[PDB]
Design a protein around this ligand. Structure first.
Ligand SMILES: CC(C)N(C)c1ncnc2c1cnn2C
Ligand SMILES: CC(C)N(C)c1ncnc2c1cnn2C
Length: 185
């Protein structure tokens, strides 16, 4: 792909984070803590899952960023509406304001409803995410495999400002402690 020149500097918004997440000083990394991280509750925090938003809001233009997923067993990545539900249980789909892919139980899927199987020969260590607001497109790229296309959501109906979306996943197995990291431009 040739989307690299739309690179944007994403930082994580602490206030949206589930209370067990640990966000680094530079706001560029996030991991699952082994306990509540001693923060006060607020209406922005994702309560039920290990999720956090980027601070940046996008309402026009073309945007690109990269995320490191090295050695993780489970995670979700993409974008979401600024007004997605924070509390309780919910489906990760465009109907609920999410445009995402994930890894779970050794397979990759796109968060359509129902979910779509992805075809990945080279497990990615870094994922590229491209958003074209005007076109209604969200695309995902395998940086480990020379930028090959993973998935394109087209005909997107964003219906609001978009925020970068992250889920570090649970660590029930003891094999999913590694962080998500925003990769340098
Ligand atoms: C098969 C569906 C319902 N599950 C379990 C999931 N869907 C999307 N992201 C997920 C999971 C599990 N972990 N993460 C990060
Ligand atoms: C929001 C949902 C899709 N997420 C991230 C989930 N994560 C982990 N386990 C899950 C789910 C859903 N069901 N189950 C059993």
């Amino acid at each position: 792909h040739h989307h690299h020149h739309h690179m944007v500097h994403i930082t994580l918004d602490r206030n949206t984070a589930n209370s067990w997440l640990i966000i680094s000083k530079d706001r560029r990394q996030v991991r699952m803590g082994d306990t509540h991280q001693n923060v006060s509750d607020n209406k922005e925090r994702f309560s039920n899952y290990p999720m956090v938003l980027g601070a940046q809001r996008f309402s026009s233009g073309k945007m690109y960023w990269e995320v490191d997923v090295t050695q993780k067993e489970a995670w979700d990545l993409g974008v979401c509406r600024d007004s997605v539900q924070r509390k309780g249980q919910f489906s990760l789909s465009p109907e609920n304001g999410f445009w995402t892919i994930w890894l779970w139980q050794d397979s990759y899927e796109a968060g359509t409803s129902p979910q779509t199987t992805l075809h990945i020969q080279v497990p990615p260590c870094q994922i590229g995410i491209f958003v074209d607001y005007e076109a209604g497109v969200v695309s995902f790229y395998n940086i480990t495999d020379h930028g090959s296309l993973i998935y394109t959501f087209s005909e997107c109906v964003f219906a609001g400002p978009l925020r970068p979306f992250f889920n570090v996943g649970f660590n029930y197995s003891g094999g999913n402690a590694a962080p998500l990291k925003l990769c340098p431009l």
